[PDB]
Amino acid sequence: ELAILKEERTTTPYLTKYERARILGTRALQISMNAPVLVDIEGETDPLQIAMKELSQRKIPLVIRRYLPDGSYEDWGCDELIVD
Amino acid sequence: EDNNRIISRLWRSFRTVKEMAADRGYFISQEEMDQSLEEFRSKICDSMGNPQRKLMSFLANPTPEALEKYSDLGTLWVEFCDEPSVGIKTMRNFCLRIQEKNFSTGIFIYQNNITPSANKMIPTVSPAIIETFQESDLVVNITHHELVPKHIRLSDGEKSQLLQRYKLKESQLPRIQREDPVARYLGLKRGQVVKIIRRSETSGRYASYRICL
Amino acid sequence: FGEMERDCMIAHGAAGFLKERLMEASDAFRVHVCGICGLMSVIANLKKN
Amino acid sequence: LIDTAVKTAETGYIQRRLVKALEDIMVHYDGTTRNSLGDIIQFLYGEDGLDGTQVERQTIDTIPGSDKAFHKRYYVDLMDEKNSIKPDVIEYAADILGDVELQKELNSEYEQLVSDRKFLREIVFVNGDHNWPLPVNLRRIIQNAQQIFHLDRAKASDLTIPEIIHGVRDLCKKLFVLRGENELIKEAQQNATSLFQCLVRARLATRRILEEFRLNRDAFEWVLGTIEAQFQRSLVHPGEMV
Ligand SMILES: [Zn+2]
């Protein structure tokens, strides 16, 4: 109802630090309770290391929903936000 | 002697009144604005060297551009009062004088004070708008001062566009008060948004809006 | 955990750390409330559901 | 010891009043700095969108100096031999003296710089203090471009002037603080960055590129890209309890 389509999105396309933080945290929390990991698991076992290793090669499947001030929002995929 | 200082005060007041009548959108020819002092002493003072306020009133018609951009603008009537402590008497007859020609806005400059019982005689002149000012106030034009930036009143639509760009309601803007010298210099009413263009030393030119009440 | 440290953990922005420090690591509690009146005066019983 | 015993608690309570007064002012996803319920406090945060840890004191070359020295620094005249670009710094120095096509460009650019001179000198910095905080350290990028590409010497350049003027002119408009295509957003995008455009136009003018920095082509492109990247990295972050 209040959403904005995929041509009228006008928020900045850069992954901010808070967003990065919550992505790493939540993805690590999922990797811990036995969830499918989507890279080549090798010489690191800490879940945060694995989450950052995924964020480097862009494989994280989540949706940012940025709430605009008055009540609308926008939906960005975590694999098109330009990771700095 | 003491004559020239009074004459100078009245002169500066009249000039400020004209510039105020010029920034609000009306039309004043340059023969009237660039009046020097010998014309003032020769055309206002009696042979005694003393003023006649009833020879300083005038009418003002709007320009075409201001008529197009701002639609609700009639004519302007400017009359300096005569009596010193303006009571009920001059206020009532003045109200009749505005209710006679059916003009839209009048300026009743007083001298020292206005009585409150006559200060109730302002919502009795509708649909016109009577706006009072003291004389000792308008000796200095507050707009040539350093600090005060430019204030530009907006039209009807542009306001709607501004409320669409930010997705707002008219109550969620920085406000200005109805009695605030640069808010009656332009003659504001409840619901009109003035635009301000302030200087800034981090980006040079910063445009900031402000609403009235 | 004074108010000033709260102000600092607001200055950093870690909202989850604050929601933790002021809940789990202190005093969590559960209340059954109604939806018409809106008061904590619900008489509840669990093993009988 | 008595005064020390007195003032500290006073200052503490003062700080408690300040913090309890200012603790709900956020930076929403489009530059507005609204409180808890929408009273736009500042229409654009900090008047420019920048952060606070990212600005550094820099000098704006245009403001100071005399008119004869300013003219000696920025003016270019391709017609007369004595006041043109030196021949031993550019290879193509034989295909130049005479083509008005380009004296047009140079004249327009110099007039623009005069407009910046009068603007910044008259309206904003009245006293003329030419040292103010701004983002993106230009000189470090310059000498980095010199080190990485060995560009020292003793050699003539190969850079064409239309790539210079059209390079800077096509750069100054890719610096985005507010996005969208409504007219208000475009004007706000114009005003939000004016001092910085006066800085870039103040530094990278032609003689101060082919007669003092002596860049070539690859390094020039690398530099423009670097400026864009850093300026895009040095913005405020929506969600910042300022
Ligand atoms: Zn109930």
Short mmCIF file of C-alpha atoms and ligand atoms in Angstrom, two decimals, chain C residues 34-38, ligand 1:
data_model
loop_
_atom_site.label_atom_id
_atom_site.label_comp_id
_atom_site.label_asym_id
_atom_site.label_seq_id
_atom_site.Cartn_x
_atom_site.Cartn_y
_atom_site.Cartn_z
CA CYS C 34 -6.47 -7.82 27.40
CA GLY C 35 -7.26 -6.05 24.13
CA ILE C 36 -10.53 -4.21 24.80
CA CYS C 37 -9.99 -2.65 28.22
CA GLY C 38 -6.19 -2.59 28.06
ZN ZN E 1 -10.94 -6.51 29.47
#
